């Protein structure tokens, strides 16, 4: 309820990098370090 209450001017911005891209980066590092 509080998360929907913050209409006094306080917001939260979304990160530029989505988790599905961090997962891709981690997979690339794992493949490189295992191959």
């Amino acid at each position: 309820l509080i998360c929907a209450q913050k209409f006094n001017g306080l917001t939260v911005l979304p990160p530029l990098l989505t988790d599905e891209m961090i997962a891709q980066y981690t997979s690339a590092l794992l493949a490189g370090t295992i191959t």
């Binding site: 309820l1 509080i2 209450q5 209409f7 006094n8």
Partner: protein, 49 residues
């Protein structure tokens, strides 16, 4: 220009089972969210723009 609110919203309706002798709603941030209706005694619901 109500009976102690003087708010500004899009008040539609309140479907909550509000207690009889209680008029002004509040929340965790101490914000008014309810109005006693002078005629039908129907509680409204403050909501900003």
């Amino acid at each position: 220009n109500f009976n102690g609110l003087t708010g500004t919203g899009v008040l539609t309706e309140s479907n909550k089972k509000f207690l009889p002798f209680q008029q002004f709603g509040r929340d965790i941030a101490d914000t008014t969210d309810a109005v006693r209706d002078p005629q039908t005694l129907e509680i409204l619901d403050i909501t900003p723009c």
